[PDB]
Design a protein around this ligand. Structure first.
Ligand SMILES: OC[C@H]1O[C@@](CO)(O[C@H]2O[C@H](CO)[C@@H](O)[C@H](O)[C@H]2O)[C@@H](O)[C@@H]1O
Ligand SMILES: [Mg+2]
Lengths: 550, 416
DNA sequence: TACCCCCCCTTCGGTGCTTTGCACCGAAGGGGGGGT
């Protein structure tokens, strides 16, 4: 027998006492027969006069099956049960597998019910089932094993499964076993005879510890169904993706739709979800129907064209380098491919996170590289060589001048438009023979009415009244005014820390229409010098323009 | 048959529950080998998911070392473990260490594996080794002996440590020895040859105990007597443009938060009109005194700035470009205990993250020598960028606390 | 009327300097996927 795992309740808390809700007849019948089976197997014990505890029970159908799995609502016990540290750290990915001569996929049958619960804890799993729709009091039962619905059942089974597999792996060092919950993957470069032997040795060792491996779940011939994928001997692919083609879309329809596209992006290159996700943004409840934007259904059409073809990934060769190649897709969307040989993608993906109100492509490309680096270390344990649509000169100018530390590992330029570039560069020194604009802006906190303007050495001046604004908005506005009214070269002086912080980071896109307008001006200019001075220190036109807008 | 020193967390605090981060292949291989050898020797033992605690682990190579070293990020555990100053186990700090001509850093963490750890405290040292592509669920261990990198290990071991060093100390009473975490700081005023000689003596002295009652051979040489300080300096010009004086006034106005006697009145007056930034303007006679007076004020030390042993140290770092990095150490804002500048570090002109990692290590090293504390860093870098790369460049056996800041340089304050 | 893990996109409230607006970030809830 599998040694138990000592499990306690949270200090000073007692077991659950939640009475069964009313159950519809059809379930009550199937429930009683499922209980009696578990009684005969010994998975549930019959005692119930002495245990005051009860938890509600329910049943749902098993996937692709007539069979019914009984469900226990243990959330109250969950709150009172000690916390567990989960040993499932991530999800295996087919692109991390090496190619194997012989492969087997088998599943443990009735996983949780083959691992004996901690002796003392069994009494708290107590439950009651109405024998005939609350006609007869019914029978109380306790679990003898890990019960479905208990927050500690996955971790305890998972760890027990590993302790059982531990000696088998150590004493067969030329086998590779991937364990996810009960589900097992077994690969070897052995003759299919020696492989079938080792497999049978594994099932005996597993059955010997009370873990069955039914033949119904014993896959022997490709394509192996595993973790939602299809494994062939030299290529892998995803199990078919079902795209809802409904003409009427609710919120929930788009959520399901966007999620499926996300899942597809791991191998289907070029998937984009920005426009569809924009449809989701808003207080709209799950039921309300939403019409597709013109650009939104253009994205869906391009997605279909990607999902039309059948794509396949290859497996990993630890002797070859890893290669990551990124392309800009516009509007803060990026896709990438990881591969070791051309056009034989291990996997693909997308990065589209828009973090920050004001950013640029270089920042986003760095974030995309950082995501790819981390995803790669998870799957292969090393950093891939990168191929990026950015000139070496561009990057060198960016990272050496930016005030934050930033870096990209070994990479080379790939000349695939649209290339990433910096759209403007602020001068380091004031421009001789360029009009100098001292700008400032102010708004009344109570009024929300503001003025923005500037004064110039040549004596040019301007003040603009503004409504429904803030101090910061007016400070940007004054800089916008100076850019609009100046020549191709201009020196601008301001006292807005807020404004200079944004502009000096060379953003090329912004969530603020006004910042976007400033960016547009900066791109048109030839030389722009920004300088900060402290406010209220009687400096230059700063003190003169501070009186105009105050 | 050694009795375990009982240890308790600070009342009202749970153990650490920090998730393990992904590890490269070479680092997982190093950990699996190291943890296998440690398990055979009883230093660690396998545990299950019923232990709710976890602390991240990874591996490093020290400077000019080819052999991997296991490193546990006990920062969370260290902040949740009872302060041993209340217990009186805490180590005192020698003010003379920073005055010695040479100070050698010795890894002595191996010694700590000889002392059992209190049974009731072992559950808090849990860590999880991950696997490439998640082939296996995490393999959890916990510590049975004093673990490297935990602040309780040197405290509990201090009794044995003082006894071991007692002969060497009495023979050479001029040598200062300070213990911080897994390291031994041994400073002397001897000539370099005799200094390394005395360090070699102490090595074999430690082995004699190791034979009777990562490796010890490595040693790093500091020279704290030569540690410069980088102060605030005003430029020297004979001709000033409007832009120059605007910069000067802004810089002086910022410095006034540190030196209150600084004035900008006569200099600000020079900016009355609205003029092109480029225009050259002669300094008024009154202004010249104000600048010279200000330069004099900057020379003198700040008033009422001193080290408080009960307050934490804070370090800020600024990237100045061209491989130049400035830093300030303080406990209260604008009361800097030390300021400095680094240039031409490893990774200069190619890698920002390596340079910043080196700066953090250098600053922590100085803080340990000068005050016996490691500061909390304000790092000029994005969180994702730092977390992606820093373990590739880390070469120390401790890890300081850090937070992330984004402060655009409006005044070139610490660097001209 | 259930449990544990990973992923993306959005929303929302807490936190700290850009200050009483604005920017950032982590949590949580929607979806996808895996297994009981
Ligand atoms: O980079 C900080 C990052 O690390 C985490 C997880 O490892 O926490 C560790 O680092 C913190 C920063 O010093 C420590 O305070 C903490 O104790 C330590 O576990 C994350 O919490 C944090 O985002
Ligand atoms: Mg003003």
């Amino acid at each position: 027998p599998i040694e138990t795992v000592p499990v306690k309740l949270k200090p000073g808390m007692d077991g659950p006492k939640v009475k069964q809700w009313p159950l519809t007849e059809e379930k009550i019948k199937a429930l009683v027969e499922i209980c009696t089976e578990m009684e005969k197997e010994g998975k549930i014990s019959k005692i119930g006069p002495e245990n005051p505890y009860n938890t509600p029970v329910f049943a749902i159908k098993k996937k692709d099956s007539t069979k019914w799995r009984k469900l226990v609502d243990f959330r109250e016990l969950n709150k009172r049960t000690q916390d567990f540290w989960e040993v499932q750290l991530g999800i295996p990915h087919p692109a991390g597998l090496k190619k194997k001569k012989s492969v087997t996929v088998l599943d443990v049958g009735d996983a949780y019910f083959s691992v004996p619960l901690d002796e003392d804890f069994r009494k708290y799993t107590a439950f009651t089932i109405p024998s005939i729709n609350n006609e007869t009091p019914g029978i109380r039962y306790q679990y003898n094993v890990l019960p479905q619905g208990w927050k500690g059942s996955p971790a305890i089974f998972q760890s027990s499964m590993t302790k059982i597999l531990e000696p088998f792996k150590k004493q067969n060092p030329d086998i590779v076993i991937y364990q996810y919950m009960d589900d097992l993957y077994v690969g070897s470069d052995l003759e299919i005879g020696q492989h079938r032997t080792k497999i049978e040795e594994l099932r005996q060792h597993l059955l010997r510890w009370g873990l069955t491996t039914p033949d119904k779940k014993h896959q022997k011939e490709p394509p192996f169904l595993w973790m939602g994928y299809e494994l062939h001997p030299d290529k892998w692919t995803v199990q078919p993706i079902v795209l809802p083609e409904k003409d009427s879309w609710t919120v929930n329809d788009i959520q399901k739709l966007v999620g499926k596209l996300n899942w597809a992006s791991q191998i289907y290159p070029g998937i984009k979800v920005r426009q569809l996700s924009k449809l989701l943004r808003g207080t709209k409840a799950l039921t309300e129907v939403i019409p597709l934007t013109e650009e939104a259904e253009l994205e869906l059409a391009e997605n279909r064209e990607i999902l039309k073809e059948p794509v396949h990934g290859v497996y990993y060769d630890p002797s070859k380098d890893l290669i990551a190649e990124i392309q800009k897709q516009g509007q803060g969307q990026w896709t990438y491919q990881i591969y070791q040989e051309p056009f034989k993608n291990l996997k693909t993906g997308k990065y589209a996170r828009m973090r920050g109100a004001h950013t640029n492509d270089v920042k986003q490309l760095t974030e995309a590289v950082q995501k790819i680096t981390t995803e790669s270390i998870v799957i292969w344990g090393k950093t891939p060589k990168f191929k990026l649509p950015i000139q070496k000169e561009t990057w060198e100018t960016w990272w050496t001048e930016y005030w934050q530390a930033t870096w990209i590992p070994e990479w080379e330029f790939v000349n695939t438009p649209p290339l990433v570039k910096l759209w403007y560069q602020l001068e380091k020194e004031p421009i001789v023979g360029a009009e100098t604009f001292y700008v400032d802006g102010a708004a009344n906190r109570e009024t929300k009415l503001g003025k923005a303007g500037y004064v110039t050495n040549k004596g040019r001046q301007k003040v603009v009244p503004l409504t429904n604004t803030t101090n910061q908005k007016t400070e940007l506005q004054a800089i916008y005014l100076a850019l609009q009214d100046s020549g191709l070269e201009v020196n601008i002086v301001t006292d807005s820390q807020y404004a200079l912080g944004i502009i000096q980071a060379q953003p090329d896109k912004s969530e603020s229409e006004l910042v976007n307008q400033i960016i547009e001006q900066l791109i048109k200019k030839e030389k722009v010098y920004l300088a900060w001075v402290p406010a209220h220190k009687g400096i230059g036109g700063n003190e003169q323009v501070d009186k105009l807008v105050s | 048959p050694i009795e375990t020193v009982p240890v308790k967390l600070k009342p009202g605090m749970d153990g650490p529950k920090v998730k393990q981060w992904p590890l490269t292949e070479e680092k997982i291989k190093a950990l699996v080998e190291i943890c296998t050898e440690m398990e055979k020797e009883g230093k660690i033992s396998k545990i299950g998911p019923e232990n709710p605690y976890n602390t991240p682990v990874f591996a490093i190579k020290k400077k000019d070392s080819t052999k991997w070293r296991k490193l546990v990020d006990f920062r969370e555990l260290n902040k949740r473990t009872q302060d041993f100053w209340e217990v009186q186990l805490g180590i005192p700090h020698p003010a003379g260490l920073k005055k010695k001509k040479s100070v050698t850093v010795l890894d002595v963490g191996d010694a700590y594996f000889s002392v059992p750890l209190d049974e009731d405290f072992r559950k808090y040292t849990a860590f999880t080794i991950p696997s490439i592509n998640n082939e296996t669920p995490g393999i959890r261990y916990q510590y049975n002996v004093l673990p490297q990198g935990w602040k309780g290990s040197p405290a509990i071991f201090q009794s044995s440590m003082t006894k071991i060093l007692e002969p060497f100390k009495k023979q050479n009473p001029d040598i200062v020895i300070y213990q911080y975490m897994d390291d031994l700081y041994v400073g002397s005023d001897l000539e370099i040859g005799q200094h390394r000689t005395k360090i070699e003596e102490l090595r074999q002295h430690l082995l004699r105990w190791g034979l009777t009652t990562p490796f010890l051979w490595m040693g790093y040489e500091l020279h704290p007597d030569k540690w410069t300080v980088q102060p605030i300096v005003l430029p020297e010009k004979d001709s000033w443009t409007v832009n120059d004086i605007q910069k000067l006034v802004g810089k002086l106005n910022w410095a006034s938060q540190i030196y209150p006697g600084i004035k900008v009145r006569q200099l600000s007056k020079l900016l009355r009109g609205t003029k092109a930034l480029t225009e050259v303007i002669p300094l008024t006679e009154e202004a010249e005194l104000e600048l010279a007076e200000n330069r004099e004020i900057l020379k003198e030390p700040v008033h009422g700035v001193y080290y408080d042993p009960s307050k934490d140290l804070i370090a800020e770092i600024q990237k100045q470009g061209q491989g130049q990095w400035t830093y300030q150490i303080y406990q209260e804002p604008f009361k800097n205990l030390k300021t400095g500048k680094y240039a031409r570090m490893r990774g200069a002109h190619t890698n920002d993250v390596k340079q910043l990692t080196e700066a953090v290590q250098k600053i922590t090293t100085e803080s340990i020598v000068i005050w016996g504390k490691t500061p909390k860093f304000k790092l000029p870098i994005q969180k994702e960028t730092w977390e992606t790369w820093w373990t590739e460049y880390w070469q120390a056996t401790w890890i300081p606390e850090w937070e992330f800041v984004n402060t655009p340089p409006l005044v070139k304050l610490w660097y001209q």
